[PDB]
């Protein structure tokens, strides 16, 4: 019943999908699936940012229109979403008419608030540095040329441009950060943002006259919208903006925008200012993840390691928010240890013993020992730890909690030696096997968002009905003695 709206930043399709795009989508997919399983009404968006001079230039090099090039390149990004088992509810492309309409509506809403004017984007510019400088940072030298602070020439350049009055939003933004401490996370991103805004905000250039591959400025179509208004507006286009009677519009404001660290300023300064101007509520959180370093191509990685192995590796190994590294060795070893051995072989050993010794039926549990209770209770408590962690986008901590249950369940199983009980105390063997399977059911439910296909197969070999797989079922729906289980197969083979 409670609504939950989560988004990824939109990708720029002037190339192939890379591991950065996949990482962001995987992480956001896991967060979306988690909230569905937690009983929320979820809407999950991703998409592509298709306008701009770079897309126009690539299109000319290839002898096709920009719209045609966008159609062609975005299709690989859509393929990436499919191959990664993304549950996104919609896919937004800034070339779509609905986006053109939404961007022109938010532009006009900011004009009506008094926040947009026509002027001159003008300053000392260094072609070699690709940077603008204040006059005070420059000096005319012996040759008569003016130089900027990096010792390269600068020259005055000037273009007509519309501006957003960002300077009017300094205090409102500082108020926002003070009243919503979680508005921009992790903490280091917040400190960078607050210091930036405290240093003083200048009005923001929001149009270009140099190319026509973009959305025309209403009332002045020699200008097109620059990236700021065009790309950021996607998040409301997908909910039917400007039509506030659309059923989807109740999802606004977003619960979380998931982004890379390089675009933090744009989501935590520019976007909220635009929203305030346009009389719209603000997202509850912007969370910036880090970057990954090989130390290549997501399709190749999925083929080589398996989808769920990659998904798990990326979310478990790198604390979400930090930079990290992947390598062949790290992926193989981590996924062999946690998935093929710990989880996968726990299921294979226990469930084959049920097949062989308990007639393929869940055994009827007797009294639980202290050890039995401890592992059962540990599994329950991991659900709560996972929920709290996911409220803070701490994916690694959710997975860590869940896989600590798996590690402990292996210790439990080995310590009980149920093979030895087969002779001496078959009923006790049955109870140990029941406990191991029931812990596996709870773990299976809890890992669905992170490794969906593999979790599903695990739950299928536990004969869990399709309508008993919500997080509420962890507590309410234990395995019933006497249930027929299918012959088990390894869920995670070793690499």
Ligand X SMILES: O=C(NCCCNCc1cc(Cl)cc(Cl)c1)Nc1ccsc1
**Residues in contact with ligand X by the rule CB under 6 A:** 9-10, 12, 49, 51-52, 214, 225-228, 230-232, 263, 266
Question: Rounded CA gap, 413 and 139, in Å?
Answer: 75
225 or 421: whose CB is closer to ligand X? Answer: 225
Residue of minimal CB distance from ligand X?
52
Residue 212 C-beta: closest distance to ligand X, Å: 11
Residue 21 C-beta: closest distance to ligand X, Å: 11
Residue 453 C-beta: closest distance to ligand X, Å: 29
Residue 393 C-beta: closest distance to ligand X, Å: 17
Residue 404 C-beta: closest distance to ligand X, Å: 35
* Tokens encoding 83: 């191959």
Which residues make Cβ contacts (< 8 Å) with residue 145, sequence separation at least 6? Answer: 153
Residue 399 DSSP SS3: helix
Question: Rounded CA gap, 431 and 487, in Å?
Answer: 20
10 or 106: whose CB is closer to ligand X? Answer: 10
Which residues make Cβ contacts (< 8 Å) with residue 451, sequence separation at least 6? Answer: 308, 311, 312, 339
Closest to 229 (Cα-Cα) out of 270, 261, 193, 176:
270
230 or 372: whose CB is closer to ligand X? Answer: 230
204 or 386: whose CB is closer to ligand X? Answer: 204
Say how far residue 392 (Cα) sits from the centre of its chain: 13
Closest to 450 (Cα-Cα) out of 23, 30, 28, 26:
30
165 or 265: whose CB is closer to ligand X? Answer: 265
Closest to 147 (Cα-Cα) out of 161, 166, 127, 163:
127
> Is 57:12 a contact under the CB 8 Å cutoff?
no
111 or 227: whose CB is closer to ligand X? Answer: 227
124 or 162: whose CB is closer to ligand X? Answer: 162
Residue 17 C-beta: closest distance to ligand X, Å: 14
Q: DSSP state, 158?
A: E
Residue 52 C-beta: closest distance to ligand X, Å: 3
* Tokens encoding 70: 């966008």
Question: Rounded CA gap, 65 and 55, in Å?
Answer: 10
């Amino acid at each position: 019943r409670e609504k939950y709206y989560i988004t990824t930043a939109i990708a720029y399709p002037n190339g192939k999908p890379h591991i950065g795009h996949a990482y962001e989508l995987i992480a956001t997919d896991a967060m979306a699936r988690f909230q569905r399983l937690n009983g929320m009404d979820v809407y999950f968006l991703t998409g592509t940012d298709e306008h701009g001079i770079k897309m126009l230039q690539s299109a000319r090099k290839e002898g096709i229109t920009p719209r045609d090039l966008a159609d062609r390149n975005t299709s690989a990004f859509r393929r990436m979403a499919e191959v990664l088992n993304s549950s996104n509810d919609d896919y937004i492309r800034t070339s779509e008419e609905r986006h053109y309409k939404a961007s022109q509506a938010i532009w006009q809403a900011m004009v009506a608030n008094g926040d947009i004017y026509k002027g001159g984007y003008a300053g000392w510019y260094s072609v070699r540095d690709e940077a603008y400088y204040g006059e005070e940072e420059t000096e005319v030298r012996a040759d008569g040329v003016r130089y900027g602070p990096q010792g390269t020439p600068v020259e005055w350049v000037e273009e007509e441009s519309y501006f957003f009055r960002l300077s009017a939003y300094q205090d409102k933004l500082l108020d926002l950060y003070e009243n919503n401490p979680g508005f921009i996370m992790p903490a280091e991103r917040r400190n960078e943002i607050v210091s930036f805004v405290k240093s003083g905000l200048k009005d923001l250039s929001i149009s270009r006259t140099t190319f026509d591959w973009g959305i025309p400025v209403p009332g002045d179509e020699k200008h097109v919208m620059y990236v700021w208004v065009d790309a950021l507006t996607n998040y409301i286009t997908a909910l039917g903006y400007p039509d506030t009677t659309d059923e989807r519009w109740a999802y606004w404001p977003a619960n979380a925008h998931i982004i890379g660290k390089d675009i933090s300023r744009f989501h935590a300064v520019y976007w909220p200012a635009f929203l305030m101007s346009a009389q719209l509520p603000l997202p509850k959180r912007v969370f910036a993840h880090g970057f990954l370093f090989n130390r290549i191509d997501p399709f190749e990685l999925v083929e080589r390691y398996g989808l769920d192995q990659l998904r798990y590796f990326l979310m478990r190994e790198v604390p979400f928010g930090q930079d990290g590294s992947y390598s062949h060795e790290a992926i193989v070893n981590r996924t062999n240890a946690d998935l093929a051995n710990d989880l996968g072989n726990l299921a294979q050993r226990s469930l084959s013993m049920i097949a062989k010794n308990c007639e393929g039926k869940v055994p009827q549990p007797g009294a639980f020992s202290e050890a039995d209770k401890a592992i059962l209770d540990q599994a329950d408590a991991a659900l709560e730890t996972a929920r709290k962690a996911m409220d803070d986008q701490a994916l690694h901590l959710a997975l860590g909690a869940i896989f600590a249950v798996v590690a402990e369940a292996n210790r439990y199983f080995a310590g009980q030696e149920p093979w030895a009980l087969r002779k001496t105390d078959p009923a006790r063997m049955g109870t140990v096997l029941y406990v191991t399977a029931e812990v596996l059911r709870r773990v299976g439910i809890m890992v669905q968002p992170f490794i969906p296909q593999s979790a599903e197969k695990l739950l299928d070999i536990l004969a869990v009905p399709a309508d008993k797989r919500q997080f509420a079922d962890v507590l309410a729906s234990p395995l019933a003695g006497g249930t027929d289980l299918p012959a088990p197969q390894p869920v995670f083979p070793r690499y």
